[PDB]
Every structure is written in structure tokens, then in C-alpha cells.
Design a protein that fits this description.
Chain A: This is Histone H3. Chain A: It comes from Saccharomyces cerevisiae (strain ATCC 204508 / S288c) (Baker's yeast). Chain A: It is found in: Nucleus; Chromosome. The complex is a heterodimer of chains A (6) and B (163). Chain A has 6 residues and is largely without helices or strands. In chain A, 0% of the residues lie in helices and 0% in strands. Chain A has no helices and no strands. The radius of gyration of chain A is 5 Å and the shape is rod-shaped. The termini of chain A are far apart. In chain B, 28% of the residues lie in helices and 30% in strands. Chain B has one domain: Aminopeptidase, CATH 3.40.630. With 163 residues, chain B is α+β, with helices and mostly antiparallel strands. In chain B, helix 1 runs antiparallel to helix 2. In chain B, strands 1-2-3-4-5-6 form a 6-stranded mixed β-sheet, with helices on both faces. The chains are: A little secondary structure (6), B alpha+beta (163). At the A-B interface, loops of A face strand 5 of B.
Chain lengths: 6, 163
């Protein structure tokens, strides 16, 4: 996972 | 019209359709999170999803989580509201609805690797970067998200989070 976002 | 529902991978077209639409929102609102990875968790037998619905079928947001009953805590795998519906208080309403349910499920804590870009949202929901629940409870159980920061929230036992 790469919790990056939006 | 805004409703809520708790979905489970029970093999029915009804839940499946809602789950698929929720999964699509997660990958859109989380570009770096591989859709294959999102699918792996959302459709896993141990994960449940609470969604915000408009006209009782249009998914505009949701929260995917895994309840660890013996330890009394819930891992929040994914959380998102569709872009066009963000910043309207839906995320806050979803979390309060989620807290209400956790409270009724006897869950005392919420853990999550909050997105570095959304830590501000979690802080506003009562999450903290400080570990307070015994760590052996979650260590080795929760998934670690690369670009996320471990945050936790204590569920107040008898307060009314919604209804």
C-alpha cells in the first residue's frame, strides 16, 4: 500500500 | 437522501454491487494504493464496509475495516468520500456512525495508518499519534501502509455518537 491520496 | 449500511462479502448481488462501487471510489481517491490491493482487503472475508448512500444505492463514500474482537479494536483499512462530495461533513458523519457501531460491537479502539495528506482529518475525529492501548494487541496484526502514519482513537463507552 502507498498511502498517498486524493 | 443520505443513508448508511454495513456491507459484508456474503456472495449476494446486492452487497457485491455496493462493495464494487465502494472499491472504485477508494482507488480513485487513493491513486497510489493498487486497486488489486484494495480489492484484496475489501473482498476479504474478515473485512466489512460501512458506506454512505444517496438515494439508497449511490455510493459516495465509505470505510473498510477489520474488527479484532478479542483485542477490542478495529483496524481501518480504507476511508474515502468521492471527490465531488467531499468537505460537506459526510466523512465526519460516516466516522460518527462508525464509532456508534463499534461502541455497540464492544470495540474500544480504532487504529489506522492515516494518509499523511489526511492526518488533519483524523485529528479532528479524535485520533492521536500517541499509542495508548497495549501494543502487543495490534503489533503483528495490522497492515502497515507506506505513506501513512499510525493513529488511534479511543471509543468512549457510553456516549451517544449518533442515535
Amino acid at each position: 500500500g502507498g498511502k498517498a491520496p486524493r | 437522501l443520505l443513508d448508511f449500511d454495513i456491507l459484508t462479502n456474503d456472495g449476494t448481488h446486492r452487497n457485491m454491487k455496493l462493495l464494487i462501487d465502494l472499491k472504485n471510489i477508494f482507488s480513485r481517491q487513493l491513486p497510489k494504493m493498487p486497486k488489486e490491493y484494495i480489492v484484496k482487503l475489501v473482498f476479504d472475508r474478515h473485512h466489512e464496509s460501512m458506506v454512505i448512500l444517496k438515494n439508497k444505492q449511490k455510493v459516495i463514500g465509505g470505510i473498510c475495516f477489520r474488527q479484532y474482537k478479542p483485542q477490542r479494536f478495529a483496524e481501518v483499512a480504507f476511508l474515502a468520500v468521492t471527490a465531488n462530495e467531499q468537505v460537506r461533513g459526510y466523512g465526519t458523519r460516516l466516522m460518527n456512525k462508525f464509532k456508534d457501531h463499534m461502541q455497540k460491537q464492544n470495540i474500544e479502539y480504532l487504529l489506522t495508518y492515516a494518509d499523511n495528506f489526511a492526518i488533519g482529518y483524523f485529528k479532528k475525529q479524535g485520533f492521536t499519534k500517541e499509542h495508548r492501548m497495549p501494543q502487543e494487541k495490534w503489533k503483528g496484526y495490522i497492515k502497515d501502509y507506506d505513506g501513512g502514519t499510525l493513529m488511534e482513537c479511543y471509543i468512549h463507552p457510553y456516549v451517544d455518537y449518533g442515535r
